[PDB]
Design a protein around this ligand. Structure first.
Ligand SMILES: [Mg+2]
Ligand SMILES: [Mg+2]
Ligand SMILES: [Mg+2]
Ligand SMILES: [Mg+2]
Ligand SMILES: [Mg+2]
Ligand SMILES: [Mg+2]
Ligand SMILES: [Mg+2]
Ligand SMILES: [Mg+2]
Ligand SMILES: [Mg+2]
Ligand SMILES: [Mg+2]
Ligand SMILES: [Mg+2]
Lengths: 293, 50, 170, 159, 205
RNA sequence: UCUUGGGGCCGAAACGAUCUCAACCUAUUCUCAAACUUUAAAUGGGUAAGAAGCCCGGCUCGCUGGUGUGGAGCCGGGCG
RNA sequence: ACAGAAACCUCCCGUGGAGCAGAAGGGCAAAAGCUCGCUUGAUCUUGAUUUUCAGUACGAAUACAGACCGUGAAAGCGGG
RNA sequence: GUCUACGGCCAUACCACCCUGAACGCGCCCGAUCUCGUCUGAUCUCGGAAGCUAAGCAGGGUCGGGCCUGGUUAGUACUUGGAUGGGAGACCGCCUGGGAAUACCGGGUGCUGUAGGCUU
């Protein structure tokens, strides 16, 4: 026998970490550096672009920290992209770019700076940074909050970042982590980046599967086939999506509807119910014992 | 006389032995009278005393 | 009917040769694994200098590798064949894993070569179910849950059905 | 004699409380400090930069300078028979807004409103606080119950 | 060999345990604190007498050893070796030093360890005896004799608790009937109305 | 209690049987700390209890900046 | 498998019971520990401050400020 | 009723085990052409959508451990100020004020900000 490590004293001394840490969602070492403003800047907000790619969706949010909790200035989701003609591939690199582009246009529209800061309307996949125009409102500045993602080259958080700067947001960044950066030569190929932004790597895979094994093609791209998205038309599908995004980036909130009050989980048992249950259990135990005798 | 008692006796203006003063009572003053308790005799005067 | 997401599977097969020393033997031992697995193995150094075993700290004395996917079944069948599909009861761990040893790798279908020699090796199987990987991921990692863990009885049952093996007592 | 070490005698002072170690909550870093503010100095051992000296732990000062991470505090320090207004630079982890003046500022606002509101209504209201007065005369009803008689208990060697 | 016990009678120094700072402390004179029929169940010895200290002082490990022998021998003779259980309730943890003189004088006067003592407060039990209710006279006599081995004033007191337990003798029997108390050798475990209901089932099955 | 030992002890003999004493584990129990501590006083140390305050309108900035934002500074005014 | 108390591999528990050059105390768990990659903020410079204090010196330390930089995708961090 | 992203406080939120989870989510999940990284596509990264709530996760349960909070312990221990009080001392009592902590007994078991969904 060996000592019970999780004994009563192990719990008397235990200190739980922060809730979001226990959940494995927040990195507080990074959060402290990302959100904390300089004290001599006082109430000046410090904005950051939150990018979180889920299993099926890409969330792009702009937020600053307040003591009661972060305030979301603007939010754009990839599941909104079907409104702009992108039906499938809502987690790939091209969708991240569109979601980030959608976030940028929606913010600039809200502040009335969308005409002033149009960004790079024609996507070239090359290093672009917005320059504030003298005598106009300053360009909006935010920083990228990658979360717990591993920030290697080609990570989709930089796909959404590229879309956000192309929309007219000022975000410090280098090109080292865009797809197209050759680690060996330390040289960055803009055209390779442009292919990814347009999903050509996805288009190439579709063709490569069709020519090689037809059965695998259906398994991998069953929803592309259903929605009638073929490799050739994808590039114009995304280019049209960018224009429609730019044309009207505003969000029309889904109209809330009153619903029948329904409860889908139990409420806490009251003290009386919990007390009675013990009394019933005790009566049952003795009652059984008497029967046995 | 200890430094705290000595300061409270000067605030009551009892700087000499068998000196007398009226004090209006309240939490601020009753707690002062507690500090100088070994050094004073006090009570509630009636109209004839006044 | 059991939920399909509760089916046992081989997470990985772990092959390990502790040659006990560095030099030509260990390099030869590495090549034995490469032939068997078709992948480059990795050396492990000694944590502490032990005089009795003649090993110094940071000295390579062992070589191992992990095999997953279909190849794990192919290499697992070879080892089980050499064992006549017989494992003792104590060969199963309380967490649902098991393993066995092989005295000569030449029994595993590897042709002998004079410039390599003969080596033994350990065989270890890590069993699991779908969703076992939530404990290995960076974001929102969790524990699988008691009703999802594999018991020693579950693994022995899996071994008997999967290979018609024999579980010797003791 | 003793040593002149900077952190001598701070074994408990700068240690973290029980089961309150680890990460520093970020709201500590989101507070806004302005020139003239009153802050309570409290050294936190988790952060070793900008630590106030032990003599300033538990003192309350006034902010006069604000930098990226720290603030300048004018805090009285008594050395022998004189008191010196000392200027220290302390990282904002080791301070907190003093609530000593908040009760006063709350009273000023209440005072001014009553002063303003009563003025338009032609009445005199009390504004100055007062020490607790002796309690006024009152009646204690017995409700037909004789007061309980109490007696001292006998001694018992409950050893 | 050692100074008269008047030299170290009073609690003048802070407690000075044998620790990693005070090295070289000789072993205490008393090594046995329980003797008699230690294995008697809680129900065999309902009576308990105490030697209670009426002073705040220090008792030497030598006087604890002496009293233990004194009280133990008298009980063996008047109740038999199996008729009682003695428990000395003080342990000599405080260390007393000596500044040995033959010559520096009072220079470097901090003393070396000389012995050990138990610091006893007023109303603190020095030693306890539990036995049968018909030996109440022999318990008092045993503890009365042992008083002569200690300095200062000690009082004898027959406890109202059952044996060496913390539960009153007038109700101990009732609690055991309804399973609020569970004998566990010399003492009794306490059963609260708390915890898993399984433990209640086991006690009632 | 077999997860490790000492004695035994019936043998063909084994982790077969058999106890028994130990270590170990689990609940309890006696007694303690200047260089231990979850708790935690009294006495004590700092600060505040306004006109150097409060509340309005405006102006300066090379500082900060999505924002005529923020901060500080300065001018005038009203409240005992 | 050899392999045994101790070699190496696997799974599980593990609030730190380890480690952080050293005395001790404090602090630290997607780190302040361990392992990699790039590096020289251990650089140049003026003032203010803290500690000992006489409110002197040194020593050590803290916030900034101005240059040159490193690192990072970046926020930032760094003048031992 | 409830979830997702980002949070504030950081166990009333933790730990163990059991039950139940409509919709949308979050997931598990299927692959390795591309980006990226491995002895190992296990992890990390990338492309997806056949299946499943089994697990994570959410709600609930336990005369549950912990934790939070009260009662008791107790006006007890300790304590500020006082006496030409007691006692050989050790110490103790009283006067004037303040005032704890175990064991033991009970109650509770996350609240909530910003944005966005689901639930006739
Ligand atoms: Mg990071
Ligand atoms: Mg479970
Ligand atoms: Mg003599
Ligand atoms: Mg002394
Ligand atoms: Mg790190
Ligand atoms: Mg600088
Ligand atoms: Mg469903
Ligand atoms: Mg996979
Ligand atoms: Mg379920
Ligand atoms: Mg409970
Ligand atoms: Mg909840």
């Amino acid at each position: 026998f060996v000592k019970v490590v999780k004994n009563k004293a192990y719990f008397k001394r235990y200190q739980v970490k922060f809730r979001r840490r226990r959940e494995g969602k927040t990195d507080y070492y990074a959060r402290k550096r990302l959100v904390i403003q300089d004290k001599n800047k006082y109430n000046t907000p410090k904005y950051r672009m939150i990018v979180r790619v889920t299993n099926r969706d890409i969330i792009c949010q702009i937020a600053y920290a307040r003591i009661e909790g972060d305030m979301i200035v603007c939010a754009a989701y990839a599941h909104e992209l079907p409104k702009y003609g992108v039906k499938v591939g809502l987690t790939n690199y091209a969708a991240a770019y569109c979601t980030g582009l959608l976030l940028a246009r929606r913010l600039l529209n809200r502040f009335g700076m969308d005409k002033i800061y149009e960004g790079q309307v024609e996507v070239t996949g090359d290093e672009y940074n917005v320059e504030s125009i003298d005598g106009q409102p300053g360009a909006f500045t935010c920083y990228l909050d990658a979360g717990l993602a591993r920030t290697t080259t080609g990570n989709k958080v930089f796909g959404a970042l590229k879309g956000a700067v192309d929309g007219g947001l000022s975000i410090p960044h280098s090109t080292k982590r865009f797809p197209g950066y050759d680690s060996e030569s330390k040289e960055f190929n803009a055209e390779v980046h442009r292919k990814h932004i347009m999903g050509q790597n996805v288009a190439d895979y579709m063709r490569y599967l069709m020519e090689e094994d037809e059965d695998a093609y259906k398994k991998q791209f069953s929803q592309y086939i259903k929605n009638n998205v073929t490799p050739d038309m994808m590039e114009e599908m995304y280019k049209k999506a960018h224009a429609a995004i730019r044309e009207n980036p505003v969000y029309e909130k889904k109209p809330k509807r009153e619903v029948k009050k329904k409860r889908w989980n139990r409420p806490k048992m009251s003290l009386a119910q919990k007390k009675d249950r013990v009394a019933q259990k005790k009566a049952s135990f003795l009652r059984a014992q008497e029967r046995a005798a | 006389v200890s430094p705290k008692v000595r300061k409270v006796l000067q605030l009551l203006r009892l700087r000499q032995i068998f000196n007398g003063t009226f004090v209006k009572l309240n939490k601020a003053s009753i707690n002062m009278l507690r500090i100088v308790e070994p050094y004073i005799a006090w009570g509630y005067p009636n109209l004839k005393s006044v | 009917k059991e939920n399909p997401m509760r089916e046992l599977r081989i997470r990985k097969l772990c092959l390990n040769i502790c040659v006990g020393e560095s030099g030509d033997r260990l390099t030869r031992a590495a090549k034995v694994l490469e032939q068997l697995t078709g992948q480059t193995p990795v050396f492990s150094k000694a944590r502490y200098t032990v005089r009795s075993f003649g090993i110094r700290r940071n000295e390579k004395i062992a070589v191992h590798c992990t095999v997953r996917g279909a190849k794990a079944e192919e290499i697992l069948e070879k080892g089980l064949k050499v064992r006549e599909y017989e494992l003792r009861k104590n060969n199963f761990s309380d967490t649902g894993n098991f393993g066995f040893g092989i005295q000569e790798h030449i029994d595993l279908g590897i042709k002998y070569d004079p410039s390599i020699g003969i080596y033994g090796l350990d065989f270890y199987v890590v069993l699991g179910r779908p969703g076992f990987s939530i404990a290995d991921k960076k974001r929102r990692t969790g524990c699988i849950g008691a009703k999802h863990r594999i018991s020693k009885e579950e693994a022995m049952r899996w071994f008997q059905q999967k290979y018609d093996g024999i579980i010797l007592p003791g | 004699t003793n040593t002149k070490g900077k952190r001598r005698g701070t074994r408990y002072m700068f240690s973290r409380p029980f089961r309150k170690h680890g990460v520093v909550p970020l709201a500590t870093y989101m507070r806004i400090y302005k020139k003239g503010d009153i802050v309570d100095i409290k050294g936190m051992g988790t952060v070793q930069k900008g630590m106030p000296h032990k003599c300033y732990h538990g003192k309350t000062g006034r902010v006069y300078n604000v930098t990226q991470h720290a603030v300048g505090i004018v805090v009285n320090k008594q050395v022998k028979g004189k008191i010196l207004a000392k200027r220290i630079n302390v990282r904002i982890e080791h301070i907190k807004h003093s609530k000593s003046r908040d009760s006063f500022l709350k009273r000023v606002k209440e005072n001014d409103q009553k002063k303003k509101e009563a003025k338009e209504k032609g009445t005199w209201v009390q504004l100055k606080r007062q020490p607790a007065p002796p309690r006024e005369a009152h009646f204690v009803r017995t409700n037909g119950k004789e007061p309980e008689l109490l007696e001292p208990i006998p001694y018992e060697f409950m050893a | 060999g050692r100074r008269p016990a008047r030299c170290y009678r009073y609690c003048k120094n802070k407690p000075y345990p044998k620790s990693r700072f005070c090295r070289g402390v000789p072993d205490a004179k008393i090594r046995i604190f329980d003797l008699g029929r230690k294995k008697a169940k809680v129900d065999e010895f309902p009576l308990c007498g105490h030697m209670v200290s009426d002073e705040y002082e220090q008792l030497s490990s030598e006087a604890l050893e002496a009293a233990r022998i004194c009280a133990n021998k008298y009980m063996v003779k008047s109740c038999g070796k199996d008729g009682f259980h003695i428990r000395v309730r003080l342990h000599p943890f405080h260390v007393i030093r000596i500044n040995k003189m033959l010559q520096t004088g009072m220079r470097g006067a901090f003393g070396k360890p000389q012995g050990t003592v138990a610091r006893v407060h007023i109303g603190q039990v020095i030693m306890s005896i539990r036995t049968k209710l018909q030996n109440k006279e022999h318990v008092v006599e045993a503890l009365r004799r042992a008083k002569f081995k200690f300095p200062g004033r000690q009082k004898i007191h027959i406890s109202k608790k059952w044996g060496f337990t913390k539960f009153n003798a007038d109700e101990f029997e009732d609690m055991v009937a309804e399973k609020r108390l569970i004998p566990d050798g010399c003492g009794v475990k306490y059963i609260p109305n708390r915890g898993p209901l399984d433990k209640w089932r086991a006690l009632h099955s």
